[PDB]
Amino acid sequence: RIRITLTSRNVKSLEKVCADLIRGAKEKSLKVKGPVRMPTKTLRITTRKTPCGEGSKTWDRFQMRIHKRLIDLHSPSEIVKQITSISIEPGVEVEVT
Amino acid sequence: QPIKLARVTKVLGRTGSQGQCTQVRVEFMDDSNRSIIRNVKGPVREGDVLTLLESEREARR
Amino acid sequence: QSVQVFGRKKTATAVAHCKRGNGLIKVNGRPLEMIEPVTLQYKLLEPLLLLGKERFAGVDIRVRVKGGGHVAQVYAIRQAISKALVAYYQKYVDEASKKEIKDILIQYDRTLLVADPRRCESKKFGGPGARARY
Amino acid sequence: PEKFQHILRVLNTNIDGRRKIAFAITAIKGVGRRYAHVVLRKADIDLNKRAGELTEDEVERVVTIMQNPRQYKIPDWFLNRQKDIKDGKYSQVLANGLDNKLREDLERLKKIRAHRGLRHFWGLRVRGQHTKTTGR
Amino acid sequence: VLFDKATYDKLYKEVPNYKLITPAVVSERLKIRGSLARAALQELLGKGLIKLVSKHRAQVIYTRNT
Amino acid sequence: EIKLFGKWSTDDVQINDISLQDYIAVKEKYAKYLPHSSGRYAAKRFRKAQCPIVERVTNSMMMHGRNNGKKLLTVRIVKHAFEIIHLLTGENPLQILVNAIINSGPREDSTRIGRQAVDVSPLRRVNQAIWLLCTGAREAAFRNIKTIAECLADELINAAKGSSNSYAIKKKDELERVAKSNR
Amino acid sequence: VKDVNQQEFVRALAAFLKKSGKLKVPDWVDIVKLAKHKELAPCDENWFYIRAASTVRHLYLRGGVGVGSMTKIYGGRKRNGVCPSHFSVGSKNVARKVLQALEGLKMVEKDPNGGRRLTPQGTRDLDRIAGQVAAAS
RNA sequence: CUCUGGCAUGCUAACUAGUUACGCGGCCGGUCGGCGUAACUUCUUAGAGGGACAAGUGGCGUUCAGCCACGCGAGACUGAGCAAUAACAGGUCUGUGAUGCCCUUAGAUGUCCGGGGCUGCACGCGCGCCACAAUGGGCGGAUCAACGUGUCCUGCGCCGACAGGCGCGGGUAACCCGUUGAACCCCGCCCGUGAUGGGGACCGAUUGAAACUAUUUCCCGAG
DSSP: OEEEEEEESOHHHHHHHHHHHHHHHHTTTOEEOOOEEOOOEEOOEEEESSSSSOSSSOEEEEOOEEEEEEEEEESOTTTTTTGGGSSOOTTEEEEOO | OOOOOEEEEEEEEEESSSSOEEEEEEEESSSOOOOOEEEEESOOOTTOEEOOSOOSOOOOO | OOOEEEEESSSOEEEEEEEOOSSEEEETTEEGGGOSOSTTHHHHSHHHHTTOTGGGSSOEEEEEEESSOHHHHHHHHHHHHHHHHHHHHHHTSOHHHHHHHHHHHHHHOGGGTSOOOOOOOOOOTTSSSSSOOO | OTTOOSBOOBTTBOOBSSSBSTTTGGGSTTOOHHHHHHHHHHTTOOSSSBTTTSOHHHHHHHHHHHHSSGGGTOOSTTSSBOSOSSSOOOBOOOSSSHHHHHHHHHHHHHHTTOHHHHHHHHTSOOSSOOTTTSOO | OOOOHHHHHHHHHTTTTOSSBOTTTHHHHHOOOTTHHHHTHHHHHHHTSSEEEEEOSSOEEEEOOO | OOOOOSSOOOSSOOOOOSSSSSSOOOSTTTOOSSSOOOOOOSSSSSTTTTSOHHHHHHHHHSOTTTTSSOSHHHHHHHHHHHHHHHHHSSSOHHHHHHHHHHTTSOSOOOBOOOOBOOOOOHHHHHHHHHHHHHHHHHHHSSSSSSOHHHHHHHHHHHHHHTOSOSTTHHHHHHHHHHHHHTO | OOSSOHHHHHHHHHHHHHHSOOSOOOSSGGGSOSOTTOSSOOSSTTHHHHHHHHHHHHHHHSOSOOHHHHHHHTOEEEOOTTSOOEEEOOOHHHHHHHHHHHHHTTOBOOOTTSSOSBOHHHHHHHHHHHHHHHHTO
């Protein structure tokens, strides 16, 4: 069995390649496990706005979304090589195992 | 002098410098007389009861 | 053949499991009448003395609580044992009594059946808490 | 009642007998809350009594252990005079040497002209405390 | 802090006659320490002259002989 | 089924005052087993008056910074407070508590504008009498062997007949004599 | 160990371990201050039997603890005087000398996971004391 | 508008999240725990899509704009962010291979060596810590969080009283720390017309190459 994870930065492009992967896999009559929704991790960086000591203690709250989706697949690796080459888009990282 | 009791009948508006006073007209319950207005401090609504210690003055603002 | 109704305080989520027995009221294995906040003893016995002793004798509910604090878990227990009981009267019994128990709980305390939407809001800079400003 | 002691003269210092035991001996300098309870725990002395409730035998038994704590199965890290620079002997000064033992070590620093000894002679903070705003 | 027998015999007869028997109120009427007023009052509970109605971590209340 | 606090009830001891009947929650509509509900009473304007008087005193006693956010510490205070006053006075503690609160509400106070004193809102009385009786037991027992629960019972017995010794009673007459000065 | 007063249970279970004087009871650790955040030594003379009963009680509830997490259970608030009071672990040696004492009584087992669940005999003696305290009330 | 939070027993899925059903673990099959892959998702996570608009009633209103009180209801609803025409001589040349000019430019207006620069007769801000034990300190119970971080976080076993030390391990993470056993609080005892058990001022280990002018930490004394 092969477990391919999907770690991305945008949710709109994550669920797109995730749905395009399971559709490209279920059409080959393969046992695909459901998309596991890993908890998202935000990257908080509270930086002072002004590059000096003048201000009213105004801070800048930054964030960065990190979404991970797990996809398992029990099938030979020869049938999954071409499937991994059709759902590749910028913003999402593919980790085949 | 005997003490008289009255029920709040109508709220007029906020009075005072800071607006803490509420001009409210009252009416006696036992004897139907002296439906005079008084000044109240605090949250006042229709239906309250004010134990008027006197029945002589209006004290507007 | 069982209903799992959760009770959510600030963070304490208490899920109660409803079964039928002969006078057994325990939470997290420990008995309900012997929890640490002895001060909040009647709060746990609140759905007992106004709902009916004979109507509460043939019910066995075991609650599992996690999160929140000490007092938040107390109000999460009474939120679980009350809603999970009404859900049993409405799913396995008739609604003639399911509304009878519903009316006696609401006339006494609404938060006994409805969770409070109150949560700890995010802190802002420039002050110690949410609104205060040092 | 009888057998009650109003004052317990221990280490030439008046100790009240109206209060309890483990906290009346604390009136003596050199013995605090920790050392008073340990010397009363080693010896078979009940701490749930008043200071005057004891007899002449228990009061004498207390000072025998306080003067020689190491000889009653008490470790060395519990005393206030551990590893003296002069003699290297662990002891417990009690309101009579504490006024002198904690005095000759300060003079030891002044005779060697140490910065830690100079600030004591000047009367300022010696442990790096910012005396710019405090010490007034 | 136990006073002379004159205070002890009075405690054996008068403080059980009080409506509110408390180590705080008996300390004001007989000048008893906060500890002995609570400690010596436990003996009257063992004799039955008083009844313990509430004994909390920081609250002790006794009632009259009833 | 009388919905007691486990020890005391409010039967045949109803309010003798005919002015604060609405803002004194005693009957079964507001009675509870323990003066601790957390029912969002401080949300609307007059929703705080719906709160039972026993719970408001509990929320009013937790003050002075240190004992803020400690309600369980305060519930046991007023819980033992009702038992001590029931022992000092054979009457019911809820009967004398109503007598203690009706004899402590300021009837007239001076409204500084610019001075004038006419009347006091009935809700302002219970909001202040509860604050007067709670602060009456706080400052009266600070350096005292008498606990806070015992000191609270003294605030009720002296306010029943009007002994003028309670810290709350010494403030009601003060607010009434100064109110007469500016009138 | 539940269904009874957990405070009266450890008060009764400590008396059980006192009668059976088979614990370790070290020579010096039994007369020192318990935790770092503490101010003075425990006022109770048999404090080692009270924590021993409390230690088996927590192992009855949560297993695989080990002496590393036991000190977290008995942690408290340390008084820094002028600095803000914080939380700290209780004591490592006290938990170590109390765990090895129970292993001598065949109540706790050793494992690479660390302080595994109680032995069948350790669980046996706990419920017996739990039944006695229930009958006393 | 955007991200948040409050609910949705309705849906999409979860051995990197769990409950629930009966079986080997002790007690009195009941009653409580630990160990294994059967059903699906209340609890957990995150995707889609709903839900709340002054919509309903009453009252007050150019009977418009709305406002107020009642219901029903997860709320009659809140907390961020982005924020205009512009202005100030209000800060930033010491945030930049942002920069003009000027000064200083090889006895140097880049370093660096142990470092000196942590500095007091009184006035000032903000902030932590109790006092004026009595609602507190203590001691022993008992019992509940959450965001966030982790190549450093830390789990077990030897041993110190504490602070530490040694070997063996997990975790680049919903996988290990971790079920984050948090404090206050809850319960039992002790203390008590007192500068008291109140107040904690001032007088052996660890980090590194190196703490003297205590880096911190702990012990006793210290009040």
